[model samples]
Target: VATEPLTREDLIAYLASGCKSKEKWRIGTEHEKFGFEVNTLRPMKYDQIAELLNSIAERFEWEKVMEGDKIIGLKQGKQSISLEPGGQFELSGAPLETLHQTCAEVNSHLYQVKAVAEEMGIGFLGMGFQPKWRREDIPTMPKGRYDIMRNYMPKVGSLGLDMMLRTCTVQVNLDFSSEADMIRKFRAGLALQPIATALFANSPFTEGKPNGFLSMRSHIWTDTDKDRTGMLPFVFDDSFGFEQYVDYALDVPMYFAYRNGKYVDCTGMTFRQFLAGKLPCLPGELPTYNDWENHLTTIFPEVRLKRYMEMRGADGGPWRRLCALPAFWVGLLYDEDVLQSVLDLTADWTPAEREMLRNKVPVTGLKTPFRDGLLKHVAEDVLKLAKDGLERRGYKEVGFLNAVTEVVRTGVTPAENLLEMYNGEWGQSVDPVFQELLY
Candidate 1:
């Protein structure tokens, strides 16, 4: 509501305000899934997507998020259902106290979505990348901000369009107690992010065939606008903190600025310019707090910071993993004792080692070479630490991690298992995935 021009101090202080006491910590999980027609197994048309949203709003009493005459999303309390560029339905769940409540929120959302979708002969698939359709085959949502990104994507990275229209991800947002706590979590999360990717690696097929990488979704980011996406090596520096993050955010380019209910195209311009009132579209007008928040959404890194840290390393998977993603990070991050352990484990990792793992995981997954052993060994150690951390919470949250424990115990990632099926009982066809992964 304030009309003052935003200062760099205001931006840095905004992120600093996210710090809170450990007792006030909460978990927020966000996940996305692809929508397809049951008979055709093709992406849902915009009208069908709208019908599904309207039906959910009417039947479930969720409020509609409209863009123009189109229903682009739904919101009820802090929970919201939004459409990705290609109708990848996403639920940004309410912030909650325990993994039990977080899991229940995810369960309730899928239940509502499935009930409405089934009546319309539509189905939702949970995976990292589109398994059966080409990027051109995907349908775009009506969100204007997406239009800005769509036009600017090809100029920045070859796979930016693929990352937008074809990818689905599950990420958990967790709180930090202080600036030091934030640094430890950010560094530990960044250094170990590839391990999470390997554990949840589920995107093997692209356009109806194997894409030669375990997580094509993860690999796609390698070329998807290097400015905004990557391991973010600077988080490990001693000077890293909320202020450093704001500096990085300021350098990242803007997609569009929302004003007067319309998106103003500010592509190729930095927020630094926007803060200095240098944007040609809105010359002499400074940004509001709302604009800063919107700009943060455009800054994509493996682990992002706003008020809390978002672990964006994993792929979207089955219902069990929807909860498992949050469970994995909460255990490692929420507890003070466990955070110390994670920091110690990742303290000695050089930047080269971190980048190597990031580059290798999408191809080799769990079996990727490490110093002497494979990444699976590191995954096992980390999962055990996460379990110990969760067990200390007294919420019985360890059960939520069973899905991932099975992955570590078997040394096979979701993508690898799908490959086995593709070459075996499925007989080289990706068609069965529509029913097998349907929600």
Candidate 2:
């Protein structure tokens, strides 16, 4: 027998019933820490990437470490391998030499994976968004989270899978110690998000079509879900605290809750209310820590506070461009002088202005303006601040500092280069770009 379709209201009512309770620190970038997808593009032919991921997963004992639906938790000492659907590899451990070491390892593995795929007559390409790729045409992950996303997204728009399977991004998750630390982290993460987008803009095409935006993936996320997407308003408020974040998380519409041998659809309930014994559960049902954890995964704020602030901007770029995202944020946030300068530089702009800048910056890159002037000027200033901050911290790698200096001087981000290629008809096909990256 077929069941009736769950209306949006049903989902909302279920969420309002509230069955979530788990006291956890807001940690951003928990899953994205390894930096595997840093330079990878997507909508890669399924056979190639899938087989590679499967092999890597097997090699790393990921399949042996399943807890419920998640394949494995990325831990400190375990040999870990994380994969994007496109066969992007992110390998990590406590002893990595530098973030670049992980980047190189993943890139090398991807090269080998691509070679295997080529032998099988398959191909891989990296772009911000899969402009021409059909979501229905691509394979789906057999995970409950993805299943919920695939189902729930269409209710919002047809581009749900387009945004998911096609888009690739570089996100940074950082940790903080206290409330003061959290506030500083939140402010820094939010303030620097647009700057990150501007500097690392790489997705200039979508659906095999030039979207004219460096990070079309960023633009697509804007249209994804208004209720849960974009920078959080509370994070910018002077009174922001853990309680406020907890309250906000409780009110979010969760996708589903897991139970013994099945998935429970919890539509639109506050997990706090659920924790307080207000929401009723089906017979033999009780919310657990895992359920609470899964609920957290559903929230999509730009700077999500879990134990850290996840900087969720910047399209994925080539290996060299990968370190820039973390370096940019670390420099801006860690250095007191640079942090104050950033606050002053961006202080004039309101949250609305920040949101506007985020949406427009992807399309226009540094060409977009803030309240008083062009974004390019702001970007250059931010880069200068970052360089000073890095130097002050004794990170005197000439190559690293020079790369940022180049970004400031050229006023052209990684995305701008791709867009230039796209506009010049050099990117009419994905093959040339993919092949160039291959070597």
Candidate 3:
């Protein structure tokens, strides 16, 4: 029952289809966080997780998205509540037209979860990694896709298991008007992603003490899957385009190919083989457009290219940051003049410099130095440019960005402030973090 197999031209068409008029263009925000019991300070079990989700669905009228008989997600229009491995709660919010609407969406989601979680004695911690849970301590959710990933992880990297279950992130999905626009935004975002990591740095402690880095979650990704993840250097080439990405993605190994409600194990098969109508899961059957879509999700580059581009730079943090991350990109990429200006700003940066700065972020963060200045100083100018762009759009929600602006102005990431709190007033114990960072 499979349709025509997807072609290189189909890849181009898919990406081109994502381009929209400026007015209709929408920004999508997705964030993940760990939920723990306030009493035991332990991660929520399946029963508790299900209760919270079902309660939210009943209270807020969200339709549930299930796997077999288990409810793992909720859907209502364009918004959803999905579960990460180890039961971290994630909000896949609706696409909206403005930062004002985007922030409002995050606010409403937090409010909804806050109301439900408090009654159940559950609290949410927004950060990059699980503060205290060991790999075994963090229970896995009953999802076939995660099982496939968990099984395939260790074959790739030593810390891949931790990256899959322990890390959390906040991402913003954006749109492009044309091939030119995609090229500019992808290069700018890929080069400047390290800055976003430093600006939103939020993981300092792991295993109950300092993990020796500002953002260990970011560091974990460095070794997660060398083939699929990290800064994609090829997009900067003159010939880079939708077809180029399609070719890159084809050679990367698959995770799980979705067939009906089940995830078929295709970990050993390259997407290219699947495109050639070959995979252990299904031989002599070509991959459909839907299969191509699923394959694209498995390729985890820093700035990923699908139909719409994704800014995969920032860490998970406080609610305000969730809004600011998108605001940062929207300002820099949404406007044609500002997009060109931002691209020009990064035009001089070599790929080596980008890689070196990316390597330094987990340890030095905003303190990481470049050509003649530090990242924070550069962040300051970029923040101003973003603010001006947002203002030009007649959106005055500057408060959402102030949290990150302060980080750049002071030359510190969120992890530094949290560490100071842990060392100074918080004493040696990690308990204070719950109240301070709990959402």
Candidate 4:
């Protein structure tokens, strides 16, 4: 391996290298869920989570990932089970060829977690945000990077800490054929991301009461570090490409630089400054490829690009919804003709229109207004396009979109459904959701 100082071209090339042939394009699904004590329904602490992690590692024959002697995660091949800062258990599935495989992997992971957690008097809750626990009630895990983020979150935005401690999300990482393909997918993904957010809107309750927004988790991003998050308006520009994206990422202020087996605080410094060997955190040292990889992850856009494009819009939901998140994007972006259709559909959308949809969806969900009609109208049209795209793929993945299909069909988001329960069946208590929605 060559260990040379990196340059701008190298960073751009790294992103460009992600392009894969159509046959090689794969889907990687990742979802995070809150772990709570079965009896108390309180958030699980680090030691209890550690016990659960090691139990899964031992029983499932997976390898343990440790940080300073703390069992922070588990790994099996490219699939990993890691913890968010607030002890949200995340399963980052391996890239698979078919949605059947993707859903099966998700099912297996949930089963494993449930199997181990139940024995330890713990259960996992899948939702966009913590329904009953206050942000202060959540327990922090022992990850080094989280400390930097914990300290720096308030400096950038109001809700970044809530995003870290109280929110959970389900996202999919997908491959592209080339830089142009990447640009098309990125633009379409950004433009239509609010649709997915609307379809999977599940975070209505916060601190055991209606939070006002359908997806409070989705709403949180609006103020969570504007420097690294939001719809990248530049993607719609005629000149957008790998290099342009690199330039954008280069300017988002750095969070921390990992070195000497510890995180060195580099908050508010740009990667461009690091590239120039001017960061005070690591003076006169050019960042390595590992540093670039670490920096790429710190960025939290609606759609993030690295070796592959990540659809980061949807909220965490029930088991079936996990498959729906990947299935939705793969259907829209994986097929050549369907992708162009989606591109044409959003071709004339102005930046303000897109941003407006984003802002309104977290409150009104599928009822949010578009140009001529409600967002539900556009959802019907776009979902059909996605289903058609899946049909053309010939993988029988169309079934995976069923959960999302019902949402648009009824013109009700998961958040709305939860609100209905809260108004009626749930008896105005978020407590019953633990029994109804536990994984």
Per-residue C-alpha lDDT of model 3 across residues 250-333, encoded as one tens digit per residue: 888888778777889998888788777777788887787788889889888889988888998788988888989999888888
Native-referenced Cα lDDT, model 2? 0.59
Better of 2 and 4 by TM-score: 4
Q: Clashes in candidate 4: how many?
A: 0
Give one digit per residue, the lDDT tens place, for model 1 in 285-372.
7898899999998988999999889998899998999999999888888778888888898888899999999999999998999998
Give the worst 10-residue stretch by lDDT in candidate 1: 1-10
- For each candidate in turn, the TM-score is 0.98, 0.79, 0.98, 0.99
Give the runs in model 4 whose Cα sits over 4 Å from its true position.
1-4
Please write out the lDDT profile of model 4 over residues 70-130, one tens digit for every residue. Answer: 9999999999999999999999999999999999999999889889988899999999999
Better of 2 and 3 by lDDT: 3
TM-score of candidate 1 relative to the true fold:
0.98
lDDT ranking, best first: 4, 1, 3, 2
lDDT of each: 0.92, 0.59, 0.87, 0.93
Per-residue lDDT of 300 in model 4? 93
Greater-TM-score candidate between 3 and 4: 4
Relative to the true structure, candidate 4 reaches a TM of: 0.99
